[PDB]
Design an enzyme around this catalytic site. Structure first.
Site, PDB file in Angstrom:
ATOM      1  N   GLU A   1      -6.253 -25.571 -19.336  1.00 55.01           N
ATOM      2  CA  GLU A   1      -6.286 -24.194 -18.715  1.00 55.01           C
ATOM      3  C   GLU A   1      -7.253 -23.269 -19.333  1.00 55.01           C
ATOM      4  OE1 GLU A   1      -2.243 -22.589 -17.167  1.00 55.01           O
ATOM      5  OE2 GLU A   1      -1.525 -24.240 -18.338  1.00 55.01           O
TER       6      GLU A   1
ATOM      7  N   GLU B   1      -1.922  -2.554  -4.004  1.00 58.78           N
ATOM      8  CA  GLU B   1      -1.371  -2.733  -5.066  1.00 58.78           C
ATOM      9  C   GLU B   1      -0.946  -4.001  -5.213  1.00 58.78           C
ATOM     10  OE1 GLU B   1       0.473  -0.029  -3.355  1.00 58.78           O
ATOM     11  OE2 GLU B   1      -1.169   0.965  -3.260  1.00 58.78           O
TER      12      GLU B   1
ATOM     13  N   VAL C   1      -5.837   0.660   0.159  1.00 59.54           N
ATOM     14  CA  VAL C   1      -6.342  -0.007  -1.025  1.00 59.54           C
ATOM     15  C   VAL C   1      -5.017  -0.564  -1.586  1.00 59.54           C
ATOM     16  CG1 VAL C   1      -7.399   0.197  -3.212  1.00 59.54           C
ATOM     17  CG2 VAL C   1      -8.169   1.776  -1.257  1.00 59.54           C
TER      18      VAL C   1
ATOM     19  N   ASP D   1       1.017  -1.175   0.073  1.00 61.27           N
ATOM     20  CA  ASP D   1       0.035   0.028  -0.021  1.00 61.27           C
ATOM     21  C   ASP D   1       1.046   1.059   0.183  1.00 61.27           C
ATOM     22  OD1 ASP D   1      -2.165   1.965   0.090  1.00 61.27           O
ATOM     23  OD2 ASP D   1      -2.640   1.409   2.214  1.00 61.27           O
TER      24      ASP D   1
ATOM     25  N   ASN E   1       0.788   4.382  -1.145  1.00 60.94           N
ATOM     26  CA  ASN E   1       0.224   5.715  -1.018  1.00 60.94           C
ATOM     27  C   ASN E   1      -0.422   5.635   0.475  1.00 60.94           C
ATOM     28  OD1 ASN E   1      -2.028   4.109  -2.047  1.00 60.94           O
ATOM     29  ND2 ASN E   1      -2.438   5.868  -3.231  1.00 60.94           N
TER      30      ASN E   1
ATOM     31  N   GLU F   1      -3.637   0.861  -8.597  1.00 59.10           N
ATOM     32  CA  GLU F   1      -4.490  -0.209  -7.711  1.00 59.10           C
ATOM     33  C   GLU F   1      -5.339  -0.971  -8.484  1.00 59.10           C
ATOM     34  OE1 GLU F   1      -5.800   3.205  -5.427  1.00 59.10           O
ATOM     35  OE2 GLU F   1      -4.100   2.970  -3.885  1.00 59.10           O
TER      36      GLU F   1
ATOM     37  N   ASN G   1      -3.259   4.304   1.387  1.00 60.60           N
ATOM     38  CA  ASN G   1      -4.927   4.797   1.399  1.00 60.60           C
ATOM     39  C   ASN G   1      -5.749   3.387   1.775  1.00 60.60           C
ATOM     40  OD1 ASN G   1      -4.563   3.270  -0.978  1.00 60.60           O
ATOM     41  ND2 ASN G   1      -5.513   4.941  -1.988  1.00 60.60           N
TER      42      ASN G   1
ATOM     43  N   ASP H   1      -0.190 -12.671 -16.091  1.00 61.39           N
ATOM     44  CA  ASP H   1       1.244 -11.810 -16.220  1.00 61.39           C
ATOM     45  C   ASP H   1       1.273 -11.152 -17.843  1.00 61.39           C
ATOM     46  OD1 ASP H   1       1.833 -14.043 -17.873  1.00 61.39           O
ATOM     47  OD2 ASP H   1       3.248 -14.968 -16.469  1.00 61.39           O
TER      48      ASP H   1
HETATM   49  O1  LIG Z   1      -0.812 -22.595 -11.971  1.00 64.88           O
HETATM   50  C1  LIG Z   1       0.336 -22.110 -11.278  1.00 64.88           C
HETATM   51  C2  LIG Z   1       0.528 -20.534 -11.846  1.00 64.88           C
HETATM   52  O2  LIG Z   1       0.755 -20.827 -13.142  1.00 64.88           O
HETATM   53  C3  LIG Z   1       1.275 -19.416 -13.851  1.00 64.88           C
HETATM   54  O3  LIG Z   1       1.604 -19.741 -15.081  1.00 64.88           O
HETATM   55  C4  LIG Z   1      -0.006 -18.318 -13.677  1.00 64.88           C
HETATM   56  O4  LIG Z   1      -0.864 -19.026 -14.540  1.00 64.88           O
HETATM   57  C5  LIG Z   1      -0.295 -18.424 -12.103  1.00 64.88           C
HETATM   58  O5  LIG Z   1      -1.555 -17.243 -12.108  1.00 64.88           O
HETATM   59  C6  LIG Z   1      -0.704 -19.612 -11.629  1.00 64.88           C
HETATM   60  O6  LIG Z   1      -1.049 -19.332 -10.219  1.00 64.88           O
HETATM   61  O1  LIG Z   2       4.413 -20.470 -14.966  1.00 65.77           O
HETATM   62  C1  LIG Z   2       5.094 -20.681 -13.754  1.00 65.77           C
HETATM   63  C2  LIG Z   2       5.405 -19.201 -13.102  1.00 65.77           C
HETATM   64  O2  LIG Z   2       4.307 -18.689 -12.716  1.00 65.77           O
HETATM   65  C3  LIG Z   2       4.445 -17.155 -12.211  1.00 65.77           C
HETATM   66  O3  LIG Z   2       3.241 -16.741 -11.890  1.00 65.77           O
HETATM   67  C4  LIG Z   2       5.337 -17.430 -10.748  1.00 65.77           C
HETATM   68  O4  LIG Z   2       4.667 -18.212  -9.977  1.00 65.77           O
HETATM   69  C5  LIG Z   2       6.758 -18.091 -11.254  1.00 65.77           C
HETATM   70  O5  LIG Z   2       7.452 -18.165 -10.147  1.00 65.77           O
HETATM   71  C6  LIG Z   2       6.244 -19.535 -11.882  1.00 65.77           C
HETATM   72  O6  LIG Z   2       7.739 -19.902 -12.472  1.00 65.77           O
HETATM   73 CA   LIG Z   3      -3.002   1.803  -2.186  1.00 69.46          CA
END
Ligand SMILES: OC[C@H]1O[C@@H](O)[C@@H](O)[C@@H](O)[C@@H]1O
Ligand SMILES: OC[C@H]1O[C@@H](O)[C@@H](O)[C@@H](O)[C@@H]1O
Ligand SMILES: [Ca+2]
Ligand SMILES: OC[C@H]1O[C@@H](O)[C@@H](O)[C@@H](O)[C@@H]1O
Ligand SMILES: [Mg+2]
EC number: 3.2.1.-
Length: 760
Positions: free
Chosen positions: A727, A439, A437, A431, A433, A549, A435, A501
């Site tokens: 997935e 990040e 909420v 957090d 800042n 956020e 507030n 990601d």
């Molecule tokens: O399934 C284990 C992890 O694999 C990664 O590739 C992502 O998709 C994460 O969100 C997930 O927690």
């Molecule tokens: O896809 C697997 C990867 O997922 C990401 O979200 C992280 O958890 C990494 O540490 C992991 O290697």
């Molecule tokens: Ca915040």
């Protein structure tokens, strides 16, 4: 009941490579694992494998590796002539079965698990004359293939010269011993691991390098028992011997234990009478999948746990993530609550305590990734163990679901302080800042900063690289924009912490997409997510935050607070409950005031801008990066006002936004960064889909949620076939991607069976 569910997943296969991989490097067969064991088995696929369960799959601490195709395969001989059988082979929930039929001899083989290291094979032989039994087997030699075609001519022994695999005969079977291999990314053994075969009758054995042949003579009809054990340490080897003796002494007891445990899973789990047979079968697939991904304690992990996929390239052994666990345990509460509890315990077992040797500034933090082997920073040689970041927190939701099912107050008393510590950690270390909420962000880590606490980053321009440190230096580099890419390990970890990601909202957009965004009047800088450090009053570096956020994270925290208030009330802590109710209301107010855009009728992340707005919001909603599933997170979590929920549901049901062939994907069709094959910028995940249906239902739209569930059931490819669960889905075509036997998909498919699937 188990016999109603034959071959729910195709478990046949005859692997020819240690790494017999699919296109995405996952093992391309689906072995049967149970009881949290560290080895698994396949069904025979025809004449070459009938009489055995081929494809012994070893979980070598953190990876799945095949040991053998045929191993302990039975053939039957009468007067020097081999008996010719025909084969029936099938899985049921909790067992593999094969039946061998010939005129004057028949064999029925049933394989079930007996302990967390041992499977039990019953070989029931019916014959009206004496017979000679022969078992054979051979270790694999070839290293690696993709979709059945070799990737190279590399051999297992060539690649791992210390593996030194050896078959040795014993006083009642044989064993395979393995040398110590610390191949961080591929193959991990202690040098004390073994695969043991023990049988209920004396056999004679001939070993020819990495193949064997064993024989016994029987007088007529008889039932034999065989144990198979993958034992990963010397202590495991020694401890298993008394268990093996017991199993061979009372095999009926172990067969019955397994039968009854599985009947209970199905009885407890299959409780939607409106579901069709086809929908029920999906639930059973989910149950088989989750239970196969359950691992017993191993290495640093002292609890039973559930991984995202026992067959996965990077998801096997006992590698465990927090938000996978929350989803897993939420579903497993409803059929295997003992292991749902354990899985949650496993994640919290490495929660940071005061005076931690590595990160005393992170009290309450839950690691992203725990596994058999600790990282070098904690005295191991594991490369997967990760404390750079955590995952989104649905921990209290998950714990509460176990309570909803079990009504066990001692469970709530056990978990409450761990949940409180985690809650408190977010507010101290995520957090920026102040507030209230949160990040998404990253910890202080060797990967993220120098020993003096200066943030690392690498500026790339063409083929030139420049690694620098310091947030002030980072600032100037972003201002000038003279790079093709800016790699900030802490900000990578922040993307990992979000769980999504490559999501549009975190700045990820391809070149063609961004060019069109600019042509339509946008700026490239609209996609730049700025980054900051978090320091305590005394100047201690606590970690890092996106200067942004996230609306999903705020909404999950809203729910965290709500469930913590509920738990406090259960535990007779009324003043704590009142405080958590206040915190929840404050988050809901911020979510509705700051993150809802009334113009586009949807919720978004907000930037943390250089100065906050007059209404107290850290910045404006980031409408220009487009809509995603985070926008229904306030509905799922119950933070939305009814009016705002009504607005979001209209957008969800719009075929121009999210109401696609498979609906409720990870970016709306209108998102500037949308791509139908992109994991977090278009593809449909079952968790986010179910979060959307639950959000709809919460605000009075159960009927529309049921319709979307039917669309999913009709259009998600493979759902009623016998393939493993993956997935995600292309929203336009329904095509699947991702690791096979994927846990949280199984979890949310099970929840869909429970909550929304029904006969039309
Ligand atoms: O399934 C284990 C992890 O694999 C990664 O590739 C992502 O998709 C994460 O969100 C997930 O927690
Ligand atoms: O896809 C697997 C990867 O997922 C990401 O979200 C992280 O958890 C990494 O540490 C992991 O290697
Ligand atoms: Ca915040
Ligand atoms: O022992 C049963 C049979 O085993 C086979 O492997 C051969 O050695 C046969 O000649 C023999 O009859
Ligand atoms: Mg690390």
């Amino acid at each position: 009941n188990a016999d109603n569910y034959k071959n729910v997943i195709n478990r046949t296969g005859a692997p020819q490579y240690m790494k017999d991989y699919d296109y995405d490097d996952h093992q391309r067969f689906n072995p049967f694992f149970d009881l949290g064991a560290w080895h698994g088995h396949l069904l025979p696929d025809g004449p070459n494998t009938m009489g055995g369960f081929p494809g012994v799959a070893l979980l070598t601490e953190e990876y799945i590796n095949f040991m053998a195709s045929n191993f302990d395969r039975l053939t039957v001989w009468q007067d020097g002539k081999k008996v010719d059988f025909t084969l029936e082979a099938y899985s049921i929930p909790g067992a593999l079965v094969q039946k061998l039929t010939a005129k004057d001899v028949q064999v029925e083989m049933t394989l079930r698990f007996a302990t967390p290291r041992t499977s039990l094979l019953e070989t029931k032989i019916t014959s009206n004359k004496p017979l000679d039994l022969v078992w054979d087997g051979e270790l694999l030699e070839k290293l690696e293939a993709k979709e059945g075609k070799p990737l190279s001519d590399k051999t297992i022994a060539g690649e791992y010269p210390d593996y030194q695999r050896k078959i040795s005969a014993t006083r009642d079977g044989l064993k395979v011993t393995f040398g110590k291999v610390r191949a961080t990314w591929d193959l991990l053994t202690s040098g004390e691991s073994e695969y043991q075969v023990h049988k209920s009758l004396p056999v004679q054995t001939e070993i020819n390098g990495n193949r064997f042949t064993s024989k016994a003579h029987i007088n007529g009809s008889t039932t034999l028992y065989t144990t198979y054990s993958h034992l990963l340490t010397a202590q495991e080897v020694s401890k298993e011997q008394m268990q093996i003796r017991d199993i061979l002494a009372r095999p009926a007891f172990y067969l019955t234990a397994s039968q009854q445990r599985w009947e209970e899973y199905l009885k407890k789990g299959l409780t939607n009478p409106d579901a069709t047979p086809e929908q029920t079968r999906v639930a059973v697939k989910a149950i088989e999948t989750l239970n196969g991904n359950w691992r017993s304690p191993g290495g640093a992990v002292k609890f039973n746990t559930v991984t995202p996929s026992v067959t996965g390239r990077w998801f096997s052994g006992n590698q465990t993530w927090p938000w996978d666990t929350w989803k897993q345990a939420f579903a497993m509460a409803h059929f295997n609550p003992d292991i749902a509890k354990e899985n949650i315990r496993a994640v919290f077992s490495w929660q940071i305590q005061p005076g931690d040797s590595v990160r005393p500034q992170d009290v309450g933090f839950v690691p992203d990734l725990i596994a058999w082997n600790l990282s070098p920073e904690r005295g191991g040689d594991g490369g997967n163990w990760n404390e750079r970041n955590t995952k989104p927190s649905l921990a209290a939701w998950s714990v509460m679901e176990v309570y909803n099912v079990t009504q066990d107050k001692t469970w709530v008393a056990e978990m409450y302080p761990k949940l409180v510590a985690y809650h408190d950690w977010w507010l101290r270390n995520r957090d920026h800042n102040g507030n209230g909420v949160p990040e998404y962000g990253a910890t202080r880590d060797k990967a993220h900063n120098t020993e003096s606490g200066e943030m690392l980053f690498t500026v790339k321009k063409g083929d030139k690289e420049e690694t620098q440190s310091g947030l002030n230096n980072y600032a100037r580099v972003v201002e000038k924009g003279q790079y093709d890419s800016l790699e900030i390990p802490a900000q990578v970890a922040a993307s990992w912490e979000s769980g999504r990601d490559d999501a549009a909202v975190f700045g990820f957009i391809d070149k063609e997409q961004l060019d069109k965004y600019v042509a339509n009047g946008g700026k490239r800088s609209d996609w730049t997510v700025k980054f900051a450090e978090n320091r305590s009053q005394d100047g201690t570096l606590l970690g890092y935050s996106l200067l942004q956020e996230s609306v999903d994270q705020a909404s999950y925290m809203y729910s965290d607070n709500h469930y913590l208030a509920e738990m406090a009330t259960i535990l007779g802590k009324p003043e704590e409950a009142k405080r958590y109710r206040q915190l929840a209301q404050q988050l809901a107010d911020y979510i509705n005031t700051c993150m809802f855009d009334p113009t586009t009728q949807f919720y978004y992340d907000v930037r943390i801008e250089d100065k906050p707005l007059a209404n107290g919001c850290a910045g404006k909603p980031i409408v220009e990066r487009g809509k995603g599933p985070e926008g229904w997170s306030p509905l799922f979590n119950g933070a939305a006002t009814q009016a705002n929920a009504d607005a979001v549901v209209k957008v969800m049901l719009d075929p121009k936004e999210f109401n696609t062939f498979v609906p409720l994907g990870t970016a709306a069709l209108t998102n500037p960064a949308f791509g139908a094959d992109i994991y977090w910028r278009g593809r449909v995940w079952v968790d986010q889909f179910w979060f959307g249906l639950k959000g709809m239902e919460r605000y009075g739209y159960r009927d529309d949620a049921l319709k979307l569930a039917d669309t999913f059931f009709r259009h998600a490819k493979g759902l009623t076939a016998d393939g493993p669960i993956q997935e995600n889905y292309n929203p336009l075509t329904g095509a699947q991607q991702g690791a096979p036997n994927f846990s949280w998909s199984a979890a949310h498919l099970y929840m869909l069976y429970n909550d929304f699937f029904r006969k039309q």
